[PDB]
């Protein structure tokens, strides 16, 4: 298992514009297009992102390309973030995947706000961090996915994904 396969399990793949769990226009592998309610504003962002007139539909290859950029940007955002970087550097390979997953879903600012859990992860207090991570809107809103990420942090194994 690796970060790509992990995220592919959590986000799915859709080749036509769809609405995410929050109700926002998305396409491919969890690629957020816009927070705007307008489907046209979404199609516009979509075409800008792909470099062609898509009419709301893309191919698998195009979906995968967006995905590659998005994972890349997630990692680089962590590395540039003063709050996140030290956490990431402290972690083993599996748990690093878990932090990347959170960042991809909720953005850098979002994760960076989990101050207390971050400190606990850094200190390697697994069980405590798992308990604190669960007290969040994130966990309340997407409990199945959150549990999977949380289990990855607690255990340092890919069990939740197998």
Residue 13 counted as an annotated binding residue: no
Sheet containing 31-34, strands listed edge to edge, beginning at the edge strand earlier in sequence: 14-19, 25-28, 31-34
144 is in an annotated binding site: no
Q: Which residues, at least 6 apart from 103, have a Cβ–Cβ distance to it below 8 Å? A: 74, 77, 78, 84, 110, 111
Q: Would you say 49 or 84 has its CB closer to Cl ion?
A: 49
User: DSSP string of 106-143?
Assistant: HHHHHHHT-HHHHHHHHTT-HHHHHHHHTSSHHHHHSH
> By C-alpha distance, which of 126, 125, 122, 143 is closest to 134?
143
Closer CB to Cl ion, residue 91 or residue 130? Answer: 130
Q: Which residues bind Cl ion (CB under 5 A)?
A: 49, 142, 144-145
Residue (6 or 87) nearer to Cl ion, CB: 6
| Shortest Å, Cβ 89 to Cl ion | 27
Tokens of 153: 């942090």
Which residue among 10, 11, 62, 108 is the active-site one? 11
Note if 20 is an active site residue: yes
| Catalytic status, residue 159 | no
Residue 32 annotated as binding site: yes
Q: Which residues are annotated as a binding site?
A: 32, 104, 117, 132
Catalytic residue set: 11, 20
Q: Which residues are annotated as a binding site for substrate?
A: 32, 104, 117, 132
């Amino acid at each position: 298992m690796n970060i790509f396969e992990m995220l592919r399990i959590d986000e799915g793949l859709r080749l036509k514009i769809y609405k995410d769990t929050e109700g926002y226009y998305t396409i491919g592998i969890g690629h957020l297009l816009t927070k705007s309610p307008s489907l046209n504003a979404a199609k516009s962002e979509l075409d800008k992102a792909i470099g062609r007139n898509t009419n709301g539909v893309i191919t698998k290859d195009e979906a995968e390309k967006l995905f590659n950029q998005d994972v890349d940007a997630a990692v680089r955002g962590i590395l540039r973030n003063a709050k996140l970087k030290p956490v990431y550097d402290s972690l083993d390979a599996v748990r690093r995947a878990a932090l990347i997953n959170m960042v991809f879903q909720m953005g850098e600012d979002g994760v960076a706000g989990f101050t207390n859990s971050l400190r606990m992860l850094q200190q390697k207090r697994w069980d405590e961090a798992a308990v604190n991570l669960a007290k969040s809107r994130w966990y309340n809103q997407t409990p199945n996915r959150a549990k999977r990420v949380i289990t990855t942090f607690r255990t340092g194994t890919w069990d939740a994904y197998k």
